[PDB]
């Protein structure tokens, strides 16, 4: 699909519609010190073998794309999430699609 | 190891052995499900019935004594 780089929508903090700056979301680097990892470290540690399950059966070929909106006005800058239905193709700011032209 | 796949065979018997019951309906059923702007108002109507009970009580004796006069004028 295609989405525009900006959009005006509700900014939770201001209580009003305000211009936002759209960008898609990429996961963060995993901590190594979150409780889950620390636990999984020193259980998967020692003469035991593998402990927790692991996936080798993948089914779907796409993930829900998530927009990471953020307030454009300063002092708010309060980022917010937005999920959208899946797609195996995705862009930003791409070419408003031009009704009634010649397809060369 | 194939098996039967479905049936509604003697089911009519079973759920009619205790005699299918039309749901017992009382007066004064629940207001849950009515639109909030109704209740959010009708609760204020119900909450301030008392403010204005003096009018109601005296105006009740007015018709109670006018119809104690209406039944006595018949007598």
């Amino acid at each position: 699909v295609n989405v525009p780089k900006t959009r005006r929508t509700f900014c939770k903090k201001c209580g009003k519609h305000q211009p936002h700056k759209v960008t898609q979301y990429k996961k963060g680097k995993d901590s190594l010190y979150a409780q889950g990892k620390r636990r999984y470290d020193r259980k998967q540690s020692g003469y035991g073998g593998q402990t927790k399950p692991i996936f080798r059966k993948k089914a779907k070929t796409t993930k829900k794309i998530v927009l990471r909106l953020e307030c454009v006005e300063p002092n708010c800058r309060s980022k917010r999430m937005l999920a959208i239905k899946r797609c195996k193709h995705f862009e930003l700011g791409g070419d408003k699609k031009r009704k009634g032209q010649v397809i060369q | 190891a194939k098996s039967k796949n479905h049936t509604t065979h003697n089911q009519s018997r079973k759920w009619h052995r205790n005699g299918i019951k039309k749901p017992r309906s009382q007066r004064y059923e629940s207001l849950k499900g009515v639109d909030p702007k109704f209740l959010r108002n009708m609760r204020f109507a119900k909450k301030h019935n008392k403010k204005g009970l003096k009018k109601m009580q005296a105006n009740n004796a007015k018709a109670m004594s006018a119809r104690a006069e209406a039944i006595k004028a018949l007598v």
């Binding site: - | 759920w15 019951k21 749901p23």
Partner: protein
């Protein structure tokens, strides 16, 4: 196995009857409903917002709620035995006033009237309905003809 889809088999049910595909007549959303009134759900294809679900199509129920263009309505739905009095939200285009109620309230307005009067007389009037009685011995009169003689007619293969 069959599909659970919300509008399966309605191919023939929600279909606008015949020579009526088009604008909904404006009377159907300018009659009023108020809580207590009895209503018979009847879906309709043209309006898809606020449709009922096919198991209520043809059923009646009283009204308990009234929003801007829909009506909350309690009907009975039988499920493997136990009948559940369940309340659905149906936009008005799929709803009529059921005259099922209105035979009575006309027997009522007449019963209450025929009792207030004939009370100044004291003569007891038949207020209750009463089923079709035996047809009450009468006469038949042929005037100057005997009846017409009927005979079973001789078979012949028509084809």
């Amino acid at each position: 196995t069959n599909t659970k889809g919300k509008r399966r088999g309605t191919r023939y049910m929600f279909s606008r009857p015949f020579r009526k595909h088009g604008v909904v007549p404006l009377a159907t959303y300018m009659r009023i409903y108020k809580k207590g009134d009895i209503v018979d759900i009847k879906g309709m294809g043209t309006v898809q917002k606020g449709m009922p679900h096919k198991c209520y199509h043809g059923k009646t129920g009283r009204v308990y709620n009234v929003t801007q263009h829909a009506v909350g309505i309690v009907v009975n739905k039988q499920v493997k035995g136990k009948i559940l009095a369940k309340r659905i939200n149906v936009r008005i285009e799929h709803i009529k006033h059921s005259k099922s109620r209105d035979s009575f309230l006309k027997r009522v307005k007449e019963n209450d009237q025929k009792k207030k009067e004939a009370k100044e007389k004291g003569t007891w009037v038949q207020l209750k309905r009463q089923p079709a009685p035996p047809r009450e011995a009468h006469f038949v009169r042929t005037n100057g003809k005997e009846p017409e003689l009927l005979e079973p007619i001789p078979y012949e293969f028509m084809a």
